[PDB]
Amino acid sequence: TLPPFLPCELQPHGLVNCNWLFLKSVPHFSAAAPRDNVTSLSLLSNRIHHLHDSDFAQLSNLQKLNLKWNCPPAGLSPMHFPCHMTIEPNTFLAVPTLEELNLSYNGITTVPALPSSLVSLILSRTNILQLDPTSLTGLHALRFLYMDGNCYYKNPCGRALEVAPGALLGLGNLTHLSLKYNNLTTVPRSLPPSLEYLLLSYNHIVTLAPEDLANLTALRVLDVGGNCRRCDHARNPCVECPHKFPQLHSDTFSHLSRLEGLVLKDSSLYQLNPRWFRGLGNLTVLDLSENFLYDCITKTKAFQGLAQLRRLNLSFNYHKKVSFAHLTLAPSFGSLLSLQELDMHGIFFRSLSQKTLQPLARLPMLQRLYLQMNFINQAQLGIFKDFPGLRYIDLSDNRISGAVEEDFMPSCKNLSFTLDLSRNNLVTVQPEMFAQLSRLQCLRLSHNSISQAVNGSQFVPLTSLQVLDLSHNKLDLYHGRSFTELPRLEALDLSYNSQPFSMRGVGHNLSFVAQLPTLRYLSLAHNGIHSRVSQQLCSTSLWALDFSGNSLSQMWAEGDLYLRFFQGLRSLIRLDLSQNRLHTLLPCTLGNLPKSLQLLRLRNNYLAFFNWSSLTLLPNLETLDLAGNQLKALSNGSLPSGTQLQRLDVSRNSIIFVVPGFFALATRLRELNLSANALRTVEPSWFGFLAGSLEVLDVSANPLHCACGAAFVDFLLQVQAAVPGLPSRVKCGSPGQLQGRSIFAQDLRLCL
Ligand SMILES: *[C@@H]1O[C@H](CO)[C@@H](O[C@@H]2O[C@H](CO)[C@@H](O)[C@H](O)[C@H]2NC(C)=O)[C@H](O)[C@H]1NC(C)=O
Ligand SMILES: *[C@@H]1O[C@H](CO)[C@@H](O)[C@H](O)[C@H]1NC(C)=O
Ligand SMILES: *[C@@H]1O[C@H](CO)[C@@H](O)[C@H](O)[C@H]1NC(C)=O
């Protein structure tokens, strides 16, 4: 049985996925295909320029249809190729079950006839330049209409979009309307009173008053930002706000009592009118980013009584000459009694002290505080001890320098208190910086130039710290007492620290790993450890070690000094020895790895041989990863009986053949990656019995020997459930004509 929707892929939830197939038109699927099981059809990024009456006409249960990026407009086309999509009149009418349509990024100039089942319609980046009562007549179900980017720099129209008065009044269920990047100068008259989300950003609506929002009292989100922009630091075409604008009247929003979110970013505001927020008693989110409010926020009263507000964005309110603002928050920030999140990144100010955030200090719910990219170079970090609810501070990308004058490395996201000081100019860490920060659970100091002696005296106050990121620094030398002042430490990232001339004539002392009793995850990746190191790592607690990007090759050529290097990690589960220049491997060196290992990576070494019988010496191994080595074959014995191996990756080798029965004895094997090798066939004999056990068999990017009709294709059709991208991504290597084309290309489809 062929893939039922060739060239496309059936996926979960009745989705036929035809994305990215260079298709010139919509496939006419066969009669025996389960056309009725199809509820969603995706055709993203093909090149269908002509749609017909009969294209969708027999998909009796089709609900979602995505035709995005098929006939892109000149301006959006990389090579400015003009495109005007032809759409036969009944093309969509013939899908009377259709509920969701995405026609974005296509050269269409009018709304085609749509059935009245439609609930969601996306027409963004098309060339529709008019909307009137005849445009979406009778679509009484429609809840979402998105039509952004029909007239802007990447898709110009020489004029404005025209939404006629009442054009959409017939749409009595329309709750979501977006009309950004349409070159509009006023808000369309008489929009459905049912609207709850109205996004009008990035037009040229430079003036706003309460009648512009007439009758829209169900509005929960209003976005009118980017309508009189500042252009000093784009990037892309941008029209500056004309001099005496914007003109927001003082009671514009005062009848929108259900409003939860309000966006006034990039509106060139030098000043806030307190009256704008009067009556907005449900307002939880306010975005004032990219304005000119650096001076205003030191004295404003506009925030008084926004007692329900939970998120406030003031980011990129910076002097356009590019210099420091003097930041002292106005007292009315203190009235934000419900504030959970405050974003103040990219304002630019020299100093973080007691004065700076004073009015915030006692807000009982304030949890997240974004202060990155401010070029702060003096910070009193003690100020954060007396914030009652702080969970996260981002001070990354500043120039602070001291006190005042995933499976291998977990994230800090569920922790109670995290401070990120990455990308500052920290060279040395004084322990008094954190004297008022005993409660910190996660500390990030990556991408500094820390070249200090780490000797057990740097982080003394931080008695609660569970996670320390010191990756990407200039740490010279690890001592036996390094990090031993951190009693509760669970994760430690030291990746990308490599100063081979600065070791003071000695080597790394890795005995500190044995001193950290709660440590679970350690990374020493890209440290350039060739030599000059302790002979043994020892830990009863450690679960994951990333040792990638060193030279164990050199270590293990150096006699037998380093043959038990990892053995003392009595509970190691995950070990990454990828990128270690490993040319050979003794079975005696593999058996000296911790017996508890479940997962071993050797991505990107130079291994041309592997003794597969030596996998008995790792009885608990479940995932083995040998991607990117030089295996020429899978041979020299087979996978031995009893192996617990479930995931095996041998992608990106030069595997030309596999011996018969190579995978026969691996009864737990479920996932096998054979992608990007040199295979010319796929054989059932490789798996003895048990081929139907595999849940994933990836055989893409192989130079398969396509012939009419090769039996390996029979095999892949039999186990097609496990083969990802079978209908399109499993390709031929020969003959010359079918080279790089699908194994089911027109020519070969005759031989089935
Ligand atoms: C099998 O291996 C191939 C090649 O290594 C994988 O393809 C890569 O997938 C990663 C993400 O997993 C991408 O970053 C790369 O861009 C992909 N490269 C190529 C050439 O495809 C593939 O994902 C793996 N398959 C499975 C099922 O894990
Ligand atoms: C926006 O409208 C003006 C005046 O109607 C026009 O000159 C300009 O070209 C339009 N912008 C685009 C991107 O087409
Ligand atoms: C490692 O560190 C401790 C000092 O705290 C020392 O006693 C031990 O002998 C050192 N080992 C080496 C090889 O230098």
Side-chain angles (χ1 to χ4, degrees), residues 151-160 183 204:
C151 198
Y152 75 112
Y153 75 96
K154 264 177 186 183
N155 192 41
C157 79
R159 66 189 206 195
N183 204 6
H204 300 287

Side-chain angles (χ1 to χ4, degrees), residues 603 627-628 649-652 671-676 696-701 724 729:
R603 299 177 74 72
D649 188 337
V650 288
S651 64
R652 313 189 290 100
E671 300 195 3
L672 167 66
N673 198 336
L674 297 186
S675 187
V696 181
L697 168 66
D698 193 340
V699 297
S700 60
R729 282 202 307 282

Side-chain angles (χ1 to χ4, degrees), residues 120-381:
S120 179
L121 176 60
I122 298 157
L123 290 166
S124 311
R125 278 83 191 181
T126 48
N127 306 123
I128 297 166
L129 308 183
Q130 161 77 252
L131 280 173
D132 61 44
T134 68
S135 307
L136 301 166
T137 322
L139 309 190
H140 303 288
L142 198 74
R143 300 209 269 108
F144 305 82
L145 183 59
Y146 290 95
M147 193 167 77
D148 308 313
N150 286 10
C151 198
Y152 75 112
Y153 75 96
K154 264 177 186 183
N155 192 41
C157 79
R159 66 189 206 195
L161 169 81
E162 306 148 69
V163 180
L168 303 172
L169 271 180
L171 304 174
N173 276 330
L174 188 68
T175 59
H176 284 73
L177 180 63
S178 188
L179 287 163
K180 304 168 192 182
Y181 293 101
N182 284 330
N183 204 6
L184 294 161
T185 60
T186 58
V187 185
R189 301 295 108 190
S190 290
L191 290 160
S194 60
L195 283 171
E196 305 175 354
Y197 303 78
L198 173 62
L199 319 183
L200 282 156
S201 28
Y202 297 108
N203 284 291
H204 300 287
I205 300 167
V206 300
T207 289
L208 256 173
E211 307 102 280
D212 292 305
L213 310 169
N215 292 355
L216 305 178
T217 46
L219 282 181
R220 308 205 286 111
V221 174
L222 178 65
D223 182 3
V224 297
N227 280 289
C228 114
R229 300 183 61 192
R230 60 182 285 189
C231 306
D232 43 295
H233 299 270
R235 281 209 156 143
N236 287 284
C238 173
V239 184
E240 187 78 23
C241 181
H243 185 236
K244 70 174 198 275
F245 296 90
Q247 284 163 16
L248 285 92
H249 293 200
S250 86
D251 45 347
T252 296
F253 311 114
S254 76
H255 69 295
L256 308 176
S257 51
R258 307 185 152 285
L259 199 74
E260 274 155 6
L262 173 66
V263 180
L264 310 173
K265 75 189 156 179
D266 199 4
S267 304
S268 301
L269 303 163
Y270 281 88
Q271 202 167 226
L272 301 181
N273 188 337
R275 303 186 172 276
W276 293 335
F277 311 116
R278 275 160 208 181
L280 300 181
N282 281 194
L283 189 56
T284 56
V285 182
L286 183 58
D287 188 349
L288 299 163
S289 59
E290 311 183 72
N291 285 295
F292 296 104
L293 299 171
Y294 38 82
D295 282 315
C296 176
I297 62 176
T298 67
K299 73 199 78 169
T300 182
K301 298 182 188 295
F303 301 120
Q304 202 83 14
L306 274 164
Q308 299 281 34
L309 195 83
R310 286 169 171 78
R311 300 194 279 286
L312 169 57
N313 191 347
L314 281 163
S315 68
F316 292 120
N317 274 290
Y318 64 81
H319 279 273
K320 75 158 181 267
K321 61 160 109 283
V322 192
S323 71
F324 288 131
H326 175 243
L327 192 53
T328 295
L329 292 180
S332 68
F333 280 80
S335 313
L336 302 177
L337 301 166
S338 301
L339 191 66
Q340 300 189 323
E341 208 194 65
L342 175 64
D343 191 334
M344 272 170 50
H345 86 270
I347 286 154
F348 314 150
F349 58 95
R350 207 173 103 271
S351 225
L352 186 56
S353 77
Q354 175 77 68
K355 288 282 191 306
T356 316
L357 307 175
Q358 186 252 27
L360 298 182
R362 305 309 305 165
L363 289 172
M365 311 217 305
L366 186 54
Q367 310 196 295
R368 304 181 72 78
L369 201 58
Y370 300 92
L371 302 148
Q372 71 275 21
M373 298 180 168
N374 277 306
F375 302 104
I376 301 158
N377 61 30
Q378 255 292 290
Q380 180 184 337
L381 297 169

